[model samples]
Target: GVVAAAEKTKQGGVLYVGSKTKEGVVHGVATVAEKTKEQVTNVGGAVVTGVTAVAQKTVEGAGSIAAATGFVK
Candidate 1:
C-alpha cells in the first residue's frame, strides 16, 4: 500500500536524520520521502473526493425519488 509505505519511509527519514549519518544522504532521503508522501496523500484525497461526490449524487437522487412519488413537502 502506498500509504503504509509512505508512513514507513517518513519514519525512516526521521530516524536517519536524527542519527550520525552524513548530512547529504540524510537530506536526500528526507526530500525523496517527503515528495513521495505528498504524492500518496494527494491520491488518497482524490479518492475520498470521488467517493463523496458519488454519495452526494445518490442522496440527491433519493430526493428526486421522493418527488416522483408525490412525497415532497
Candidate 2:
C-alpha cells in the first residue's frame, strides 16, 4: 500500500511525498517541489500521508491500484 502525509504551510518551500505499507511501515520518500513543477506544473497544495484519494471505506487512486495488484499477486 501507499500512504501519503501532507501539511500546508504559509511559507513557500519544498514538499515531501512519502509511501508506506498497510502496517504503517514507511517504504520510500521523495521531494515534490521540483518534480511537481517538472511533472504536473503545480505545487500549490498539501502533501497527504496516504495514497492519493485513498479512503478507509472507498478504494481509489494509487491505493486502489495497489489493492488490485495484490489480488493478482
Candidate 3:
C-alpha cells in the first residue's frame, strides 16, 4: 500500500482523466483487408478437357517420347 500512494496523486489520456477511450481511434483497418471470394467454372471447363485429350493421346502410343526413350534398352 505504501507505493500505491504515489500512483493516487497523479494519473494520465483524456480531459476526464478516468476515461481513455473518449477520443480513441475507430481502428477500422480489417474492413479494407475484406477477405476472399469465389467465381465461375464455365470458362475453365473446356480448357481442362483440351489438356487431358492431348496428354492421354501421347501416353497411349510408342511414338511418344516416354516410349522412344526406353525401347533401345
Candidate 4:
C-alpha cells in the first residue's frame, strides 16, 4: 500500500496525460488501437475456434466414459 501509493504516478500519469493531451496523446492511442483492432479480432476468432475444438474433444471424451461405464447399452 505504502510503496504503491508512493509510485502511483505511472498509473495515474498515463491516464492524465492521455486525457489531458487529447489531440496528441489520444490521437496516438486511437491510432494504436486502430491497428490493434485487427489483431484483437484475429485473436478473438482464434480463441473461439479453439474453444469449439476443445468442446468437441470434451464431448468425445464423455462418449468414451459413457461407453466404459456400460451407459452405451
Candidate 5:
C-alpha cells in the first residue's frame, strides 16, 4: 500500500483542494484529483493495517526474547 501510494503521488496524481455540491457531487474541473484522493485514502487504510500487524508482531517477539533471557516473569 505504501509503495502504491508513493507511485500514485509520483504519477501526477491530483489533490483535492475544494468542496463538493449539495447533491453529493464534485463541482469543479478537478474531478481527477478527487478520484486520486479516494485512491490514496484506500491505500492509506491498507498501510495502517500493515503497520499495526508489524507492531503487534514486534511486541510479541520482544516479549518472547525477554522471557528467554529471564528479564521478566
Candidate 6:
C-alpha cells in the first residue's frame, strides 16, 4: 500500500509511503469457538500457504477487540 507524492520543495521529490495503513489485529478466538462452523468454512476456503488462517483471524479479532477497549488507539 505505497503511495507516491511530491514534497513541498520547488523541485519536489517523490515520497513513497503507506497510505490507508491498517495496524493491529482482531482477536477472534471466542468468535471462532462460538462459530466453529464458520471458522472451519473459512479455513477450508483459504488461499493456502501460511500459518493457520483461523488462528490469524482469531488473533486479528482479538486485537480488534483490544483496540476497541482502548488497549490500542
Q: Give the candidate number with the greatest lDDT.
A: 2
lDDT per residue (tens digit) for residues 1-73 in model 6: 2333433435554545443534645454343355342332223122433222322343232111111122343
Better of 2 and 3 by lDDT: 2
The Cα error of candidate 4 at residue 7, in Å, is 39
The order of the candidates by lDDT, greatest first, is 2, 6, 3, 5, 1, 4
List the lowest-lDDT window of 10 residues for candidate 2: 61-70
Task: Please list all clashing residue pairs in model 2, or write none if there are none.
Answer: 3-49, 4-48, 4-49, 4-50, 5-47, 5-48, 5-49, 6-47, 6-48
Candidate 6 residue-wise lDDT at 22 = 48
Model 2: residues with Cα > 4 Å off, grouped in runs = 11-71
Winning model by TM-score:
2
Model 5 Cα lDDT, one tens digit per residue, 1-73: 1122122233454444454345443233222543342222121221223211222223221111111222254
Clashes of 1: 0
When summed lDDT is taken over every stretch of 10 residues in candidate 6, the lowest stretch is: 61-70
Q: How well does candidate 4 score on lDDT at residue 62? A: 14
Model 2 scores a TM of 0.17
Scored against the true structure, residue 30 in model 2 reaches a CA lDDT of 62
Which scores better on TM-score, 2 or 5? 2
- Backbone N/Cα/C clashes per model: 0, 9, 0, 0, 0, 12
Cα displacement (angstroms), candidate 2, residue 35, comes to 36
lDDT score, candidate 2, position 24: 52
lDDT of each: 0.25, 0.38, 0.27, 0.24, 0.27, 0.33
Measured with C-alpha atoms, the lDDT of residue 41 in candidate 1 is 17
* Window of ten residues with lowest summed lDDT in model 1: 60-69
